[PDB]
């Protein structure tokens with residue numbers, strides 16, 4: 001063929017139909033401008049929020065946060081919870097690991113007192129209780145800690161967990177689209193993950209990069225999240241942030257990094273300057289600066305969201 005102009009129109013149609021038959025996000029161009037939804041649960045890391053393209057987690061979708069032991073998964077999830085609550089939303093936690101430490105959760109901004117916690121007796125029950133809560137249309141965000149831990153009733157008394165997820169997720173997936181409840185599934189390191197991989201609209205890969213140090217010992221860790229699946233925005237985008245031991249995700253920390261990576265914060269050797277005055281000498285001070293000077297911190301957050309979306 002020798003075509004050229006009529007191609008960008010035929011393709012356009014193709015896409016358009018693919019879009020309508022299988023839903024928005026069925027095909028995209030990695031370079032495409034992300035759609036901008038109304039509601040979205042911020043993750044608490046401006047970087048991860050943009051890597052997600054929509055500023056936060058989508059609603060009414062199943063999210064999957066997988067990765068190895070102590071990567072930041074539960075942290076990231078607990079944050080998405082602390083934000084859903086901040087907006088006056090109610091959350092639930094389906095515990096099948098019995099490892100949730102509220103003291104920490106509270107420090108992140110979680111209204112632990114109002115947190116609906118469940119601890120099922122079988123993997124089926126877990127999803128059932130999940131579904132039932134979901135359908136009430138009262139929940140905003142539901143976190144199910146560990147897919148690996150939802151053992152079927154049978155085993156508790158041959159690919160059972162696989163079938164279990166499949167069915168469970170088939171049913172649950174519809175109720176979510178109609179309730180606007182986003183559900184997060186934590187995954188270790190794949191059992192029933194085989195299907196979750198497909199039902200999931202967003203799939204994040206969290207891994208621990210470096211053990212953040214500063215003179216003394218490791219006061220935190222540098223986490224790297226990679227969205228390997230994103231049906232709401234072009235996928236394959238990654239982000240890095242710091243989780244300080246006991247503190248969680250350093251918000252300001254992202255403000256700085258994301259700040260300089262957008263020309264909003266100058267770096268003149270150890271010094272972090274922001275449109276005139278100085279923030280501090282050394283990322284930590286800069287960090288500390290923003291944490292006690294919330295006002296400006298918010299200013300920087302606002303300006304990056306104004307510069308991208």
Ligand SMILES: Nc1ncnc2c1ncn2[C@H]1C[C@H](O)[C@@H](COP(=O)(O)OP(=O)(O)OP(=O)(O)O)O1
Nearest residue numbers: 068069070071072073074075076101104221245246
């Ligand atoms: N109660 C706590 N107090 C202080 N730091 C904590 C606490 N819980 C977790 N962390 C810190 C230490 C770890 O480096 C980091 C782990 O994040 P986390 O979200 O708990 O990872 P994860 O959920 O992927 O792994 P895990 O399998 O251990 O549950 O957070």
